[model samples]
Target: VNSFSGYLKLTDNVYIKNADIVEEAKKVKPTVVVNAANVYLKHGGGVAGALNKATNNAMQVESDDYIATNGPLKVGGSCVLSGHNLAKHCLHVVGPNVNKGEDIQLLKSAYENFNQHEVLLAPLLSAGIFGADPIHSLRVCVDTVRTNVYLAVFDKNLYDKLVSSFL
Candidate 1:
């Protein structure tokens, strides 16, 4: 099992860690792992791509099938999929794109969607290509979740920022 560098307790049930989300999922076997997905649920780049690649494109096939059957997700919407080899289930959430004038509430909604799970492993949504501010995204993640949340942050600089600011 990979060890977390450290973690900050955001709430009684929420924690942030500087670690690889996929690896953490493999180790902890959380109830669900979240993919910071696009509206189309395409596993093309960023977190989605990584998860897709990690699952050897199984996720991409499932995602394509899902979109074909259920249509594209709205901003801040989510759906669940098979994790293939990573975890039991993968929750694909479409976070808001700040560049498109999507509000923070939409981002909050993305995080809120994970509340149904007992243990969740997710990345910092909306902070990558979606263009939400890292600190702001971190705050939204920490503030909104009420379940046992393990937030995986890969970027050292952002991890330090979150730890320094929130811890």
Candidate 2:
């Protein structure tokens, strides 16, 4: 068991935290939390899926409506909306931009859409399911985005891993 509930600043306002993303969002009551996925805004997997359960599936329907009306959102595109489970607003990102060699750049574009005042919560976007290094992937989001970040970590050992890797 671990008791580390602290956060580390990656750059400027960007921070990496160890905690439950959904629970922490409710605590801070941020104005926005980001959802990383395709343009369809399908909240049926990963962190987006958790957000679906958190909001009792309201965010899914709301997001689907926007996609239905706005047509499909391409990678590197962003859209904002209300009706989030914890945060007052949500930002959805398709997270796919540019040529073959610049994949991380696309994810950066998604994080870049949100402004400074909005506290952002996101999973290790490309680290887990996408198989990027957790620390490196997080740094891209932190350094590029430049906002208040509330990172969610499910692994109890994530902090130790990060400290050993980056600290």
Candidate 3:
């Protein structure tokens, strides 16, 4: 706590993504993605706002200067449901109903995007996005996924607290 600009605030990635930096995701497209948030964890689970696979057919955002959707998505359907409906392309990833976890696809796919130099941001912190609720969905993204060690904090006591406070 002595210094502020040194810790790797991964939990803030949600706010960062909303700002639209999209950092390394300039090339992300046609990818199955998991969608959830605090406002998302308690989703209606009834297709209430569950876009009917047709939105993707009509959505397009600016991307890197060297890529063209590869091809018309699926040549038919338009639904590419994903987190906050923000990603250029979203895959079908099922996360835990509560603020627990997601199918392996979420982490794996996100890791893949990372390895490909793409920016990955998750806004689902239990109702933080889709419908789960506010703090419910954010529990893990802000806690569980955090690095056990505070790489930027020089103090050992404070660093230990940050990691132990995940629960």
Candidate 4:
């Protein structure tokens, strides 16, 4: 198992860390888990897939129902739904188009879409599956989710690169 590695505080209580999302979520017992999904709400792969499994597929189907009515989310848009199995709620955000940086603003908006909670857990948005620079992507999240205490999950290599950027 990839253990809970370590964490860094971006702001007062908001943090960035290198660890498995599921493992950290277990430890933190966050009230919500945010999944960075495509507009289709397809959690079939990557962090979104892991989130679907964590929620025992509750998130995927519920999101599908909403998308069926509202249409796929626009980039920078989100769908916040009741959490199913592990967490109390889940938030899904559509990522920006490729080859663009600073689209981190869109992600920041996603975080803003929901009311602040005491604790939330989120993947390193756009860093892995979306090919964004970890430093910039995380900067955006930290900038937006300031009022809440949360953990930013990341793999070891990406975590190292992100940590090193500030050093």
- The prediction achieving the highest TM-score against the true structure is 1
Which pairs clash (backbone N, Cα, C closer than 3 Å) in model 1? none
Q: Hey, what RMSD does candidate 3 come out at?
A: 12.2
List model 2 lDDT by residue over 47-163, tens digit each: 678777889989888888987898878667778788465887777766652223436666666556755434676676655554556777666666676556666776769866875
The collision pairs in model 4 are 83-89
Q: Which candidate wins on lDDT?
A: 1
List the lowest-lDDT window of 10 residues for candidate 2: 93-102
Alpha-carbon deviation at 151 in model 1, angstroms? 0.3
Candidate 2 residue spans exceeding 4 A from truth:
1-5, 96-102, 115-118
Per residue, candidate 4 scores C-alpha lDDT tens digits across 45-85 of 88888878887887788988988989888777777787676
TM-score of each: 0.91, 0.80, 0.30, 0.80
Model 3 spans with C-alpha error above 4 angstroms: 1-34, 37-86, 98-118, 128-133, 146-167
- CA RMSD for every model? 2.4, 4.5, 12.2, 4.0
lDDT of 1 by residue, 1-167 (tens): 23334667778877788887877777777668999998888888888888898899999988899999999998988999997888889999989988788876898888889887877788988987788887888788778887777788888788888888874
lDDT of 4: 0.69
